[PDB]
Amino acid sequence: ATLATKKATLVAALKDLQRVTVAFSGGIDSTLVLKMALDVLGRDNVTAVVANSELFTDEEFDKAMSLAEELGANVQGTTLDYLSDDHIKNNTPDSWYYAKKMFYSRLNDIAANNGSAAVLDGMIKARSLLQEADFFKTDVRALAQELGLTNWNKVASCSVSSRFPYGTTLTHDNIAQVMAAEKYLRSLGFPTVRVRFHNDIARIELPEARIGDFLVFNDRVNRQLQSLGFRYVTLDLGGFR
Amino acid sequence: ATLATKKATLVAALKDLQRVTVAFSGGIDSTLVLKMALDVLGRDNVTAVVANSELFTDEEFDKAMSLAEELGANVQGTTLDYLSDDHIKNNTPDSWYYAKKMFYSRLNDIAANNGSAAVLDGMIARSLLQEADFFKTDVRALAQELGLTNWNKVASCSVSSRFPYGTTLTHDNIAQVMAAEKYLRSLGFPTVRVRFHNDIARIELPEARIGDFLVFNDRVNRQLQSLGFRYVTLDLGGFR
Amino acid sequence: ATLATKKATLVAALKDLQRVTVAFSGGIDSTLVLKMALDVLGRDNVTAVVANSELFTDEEFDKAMSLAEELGANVQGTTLDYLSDDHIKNNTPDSWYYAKKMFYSRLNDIAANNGSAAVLDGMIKARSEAGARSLLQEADFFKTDVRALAQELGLTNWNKVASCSVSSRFPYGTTLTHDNIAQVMAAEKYLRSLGFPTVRVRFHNDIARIELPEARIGDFLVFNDRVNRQLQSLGFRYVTLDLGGFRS
Amino acid sequence: ATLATKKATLVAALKDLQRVTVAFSGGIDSTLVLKMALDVLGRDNVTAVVANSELFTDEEFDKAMSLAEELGANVQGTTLDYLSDDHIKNNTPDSWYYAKKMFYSRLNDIAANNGSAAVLDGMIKLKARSEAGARSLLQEADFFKTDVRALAQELGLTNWNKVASCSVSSRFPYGTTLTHDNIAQVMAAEKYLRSLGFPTVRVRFHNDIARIELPEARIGDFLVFNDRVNRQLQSLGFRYVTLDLGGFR
Amino acid sequence: ATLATKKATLVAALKDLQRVTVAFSGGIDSTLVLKMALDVLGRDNVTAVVANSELFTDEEFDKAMSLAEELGANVQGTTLDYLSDDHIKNNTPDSWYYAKKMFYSRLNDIAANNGSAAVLDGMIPGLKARSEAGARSLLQEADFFKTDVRALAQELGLTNWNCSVSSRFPYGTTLTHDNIAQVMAAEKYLRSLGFPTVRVRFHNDIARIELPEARIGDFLVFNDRVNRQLQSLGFRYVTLDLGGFR
Amino acid sequence: ATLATKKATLVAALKDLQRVTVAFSGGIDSTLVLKMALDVLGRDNVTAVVANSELFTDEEFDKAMSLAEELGANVQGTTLDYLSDDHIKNNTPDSWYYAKKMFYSRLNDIAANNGSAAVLDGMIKNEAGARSLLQEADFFKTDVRALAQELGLTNWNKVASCSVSSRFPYGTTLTHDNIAQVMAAEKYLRSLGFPTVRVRFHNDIARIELPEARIGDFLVFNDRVNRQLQSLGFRYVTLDLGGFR
């Protein structure tokens, strides 16, 4: 289809819902949904909710809260303690299962309190309207460009649980350790980076085309990540993913 | 804290001034102010001013003069002789102050003489984008809304910072430093300083670009030597 | 002299033509012509045409078609077989000319069959021989006038990077075939997917001569072996990197 | 004393022994002992023995066998199963002692079966050697490292192992149990890395993690090989293949 | 059996020929043959010959000539025009054979004119190039392995010892005096920048540089100088093989 | 001439001198001279002299003293005060001349007092109180380690010592402090794996010259070298884009 046909399904789907609460993370997808809902449904009939968790950075939470205000939405912060579930706290392979299970249960209850007909997320190809309207990665960038949206989270980052091996118990300490390492690495000019936690070993994942540029920082990163508690600081030769 | 609320603040403030003179550098901030001023006050009530100076590049001047005309403004070039002032010519730690005073005094005289209510600049003189609480994100959202895509993106700094305190700035050693930085930028290094130390050139690059730079060592060495440096070096501390 | 007089010359030229066919590449210039043509003459009186050929990417074609639909134009792709012309098939130094004569004759025939008064291209200040109009050139548009009017019409999206014919990857006198062209484009596509958007894979039979911007060559080294084996499996015997860098 | 007096002490000790078996590693010290032994007692009365084990690389074994023959000695390889001793298999700080103990007793049996009066090693100015009865003639004659370099030049000796081979056990943390499998894993990984042009390298074993140590001044050169090293070491059984940012130690 | 029995066959064979001409390259193999012949037959009955050709560098020749003088042989250079033979000039896959045929014919012509009983080399499309010449490889007849030659080189006290440029050209490409000088100048320039192991493969207007992969990072600082130098030697395009040397 | 004849000229020339004093730096040329002198005249009539000075490192001096003993020589250290001469102290373009005059004048006094017939150095092909026997016998660089390998010689200083004067511009006054500064910087750089290096002194700027083929390898050390040379007193630490020499 044309982008206009997919955009029309999205307006038509939204009018049919009349009042929605939209799970807003700040990535390009959720920024498109949040804006489309505000444009078809009005400020007072769309609720943006930003999840606060121990698994995400305060900066990503703060950036989404600020773009939702910048977009003109009533946005509400709700804080989730993902670590209360021992399936998640011990990061067993089902651990995504309960994390999504907790995210949507908080989101479903919020919709009852402001009278929305459904809560929307930003999944592409709970209702995920961009997938129902058959939006692909190229379609989402095209519509956002047409809607004048310029600011969104270019740092498509993930819950910090993905840095830990299955069976490792998450702690306030080792999560902060992983996140302080990634924040330090990003401050040197590597916006895409993972610091995988392996007890005494830190395993750094960088995009392969950035590894040559990284070499000037080896010693400072080595000494900095050792001061955060790692005994050995290493670079994955496989790169990011 | 909506963009629509800040844009109304900026429109309202511009309506209260009626006739404005805009300090126009050509960056996104000053280009946003110049269009907003044209859209609410009209061509005949806005004067765009572009400083022609020895401390900034002719490329920055030519691009700004053309971008003001392209946006639909009446544009005026004014030329500042910063080196006639001995505080700037001798590069003291206070020279920035005298340079800013000479610049804002010329802009005040133009605005007084064309009947403007204020001089405007792009800071985030009135800085209305700062008064309306525009952030870098707000400014990119409004420029897209006005259909503005074209502006200079090479961040501009006075060439004074390339010289040690106590150094006498001259037309020749300024031209030397600027030809060197223009050459380096043309190789693909948009953020670069050639600090001047008489017979030594001290190059600052972002540390993450120094590996990429090595394929050019010999050409940079020979080019900056032909520009008058005897030794061409790379600071191991990098940019800053 | 002023933009407003230049915009009026263009409006008048379009009103006089009443019905037009637009050669649409997706760049800023043809995007401005198509937008003005749609605003002045209406959707049913404008046909946007995007050429599909073996000498350009299927990506480039898909994006140009999508840019014309996004503007609100009825757009039709036409398919050109440039290799049927022996100046192009044998990559003579004048082959660009025969490619454009063939392109403009197809556009003239499309215009004849839908009732347009002219074919419009986006040239500014072999088309003289087919009768294409460059209304921006006639109205004295320079690059800054195009950027000014596009911003006053709210146009922000277009192709920022011009397309070059894959003919430029082959030495003069080399015979282009559906097979070796597919080789050059698959090699360049693989390279772009590793993070090198500006690249050329020059064809010298058993040798691929890769052109990269010199500032990226340090970044490229982590890929030497994968590029070597990938381009060999595409049919090259030797995979090399030009020491002069991109366009030397 | 003088180099000449020390050289005469060494000559005298060898003539009194008549027939010797020489523990030959290829380093400068055992190379001096073997050369002196051949110069004083002749090819027919000297047996050079080179230990082959799974704790040292096959490349070093072949190089020592060739350095011994090139010097003119009858040279014999013996194979040691160091993992048969559990003091060695359990990677304790005294495991080196039991490895030397097993090596010196095999040399004693070889010495008994070829009629030698002593086993000679190349030690200069400790308890496994002395328990076994091996003699260190350079130490008895009071050779220091400079004396060994002096007499080596006098005899025209130029070729020897500059690299000192270390046991693969140092790639494993203390208390990690050595196995035929994890040793072969570490040794094949290092062998591939050396074959790319990196003679000084360690692959430290961390179960599913391989931690590569290279001299920092070579890490820039290594970049062209990351992807092949990753897949090669993954095919050897490591899940993760990493480069230590600290370099070689 | 033992090394002493293997060198014993070589003593006997050398004693029976009395006067020999020795094809001398300077590698470990030919230096042992030349030293054995001098020790068994004496200086006045041994002629060492070193081939000088356009397909090798004047340094390879100069190093080989000294090697034989230091061994104690009377040494003689002969110069061959390998490009006169069209198997070699057109770089067919067998031209190594025809180069050795021309070499052994010149050496047989040298040996007949000084009266040697045979031509000796250091070895361990038609008839084998030696057998067709009559050349003996005495180290091969004595069943020498690479260890025996390294062993025997030390029992006689040997201390000093040591590729055709055709391998820079594709099969079917015509060798000329000029493109040979071009390739040889290009490799000398690269070696002088610190790359002792290097090949400049000639592909007409394209130079394809082969380097050990572990040196390509070090090479980048030289790209532009190498590009312009090899262009000035006559190449239009100067490239680096991503597969590296070998 | 053949290498064997050049060796005979050297043997004959050494036998005609009977007792020699050898200027010994530890490089290949002077170790070849020192070895030939011992092999032809015997230890008791060869005196090896190693100059200790502020313009060369203590590390090269100790290595040279120990290499002479390893060669079989009686070795004697002598101390030179190069900075006592004002051409050297003020780094005039003349200073090489006064440094060589002071070096050879000291060696001649040692030679006179131990009864040697000549002072020997290791100069080759391509002072008047010095014989360079390798030069008289027409030895080239190829001849020297052809012959050095025939004597089995392996240990010698493989990177060339140069006077620290070349790290300072002509006209700069050399002092104990700025020499110590340059010498601690080059020693640090060598300790990271860069045996061939110059730290050129330009007051508050250090200009590091490295062989161009090593500059890619050096990037992993930029920050450590920057901080180390700053702690030695340099304000700016830079890398010459032209590389070494």
Author numbering:
A (entry chain E): 2 to 126, 144 to 259
B (entry chain D): 2 to 125, 144 to 259
C (entry chain F): 2 to 126, 138 to 260
D (entry chain C): 2 to 126, 136 to 259
E (entry chain A): 2 to 125, 134 to 171, 176 to 259
F (entry chain B): 2 to 127, 141 to 259
Publication text:
Nevertheless, the tri-Asp site in LarE represents an unusual metal binding site that selectively and stoichiometrically binds certain multivalent cations. In the apoprotein structure the tri-Asp site is pre-formed to receive a metal ion by a hydrogen bond network consisting of Asp231, Arg228, Gly207, and several water molecules filling the site.
For small molecule complexes in the Cambridge Structural Database (CSD) the most common and second most frequent coordination numbers for Mn2+, Fe2+/3+, Co2+, Ni2+, Zn2+, and Cd2+ are 6 and 4; while for Ca2+ they are 6 and 7; and for Cu2+ they are 5 and 635. The results show a similar picture for these elements with the most frequent coordination number being 6 for Mn, Fe, Co, and Ni; 7 (closely followed by 6) for Ca; and 4 for Cu, Zn, and Cd (with 6 coordination being less frequently observed). Several metal soaks (Co, Ni, Zn, and Cd) also resulted in binding of these metals to surface exposed residues. These partially disordered sites only appeared after metal soaks, showing a significant electron density peak and in some cases anomalous peaks. This resulted in higher B-factors of these metals compared to the tri-Asp site. We reason that the tri-Asp site captures low levels of contaminating metal ions, most likely Ni, Co, or Cd, from the Superdex 200 resin used for other protein purifications in the laboratory.
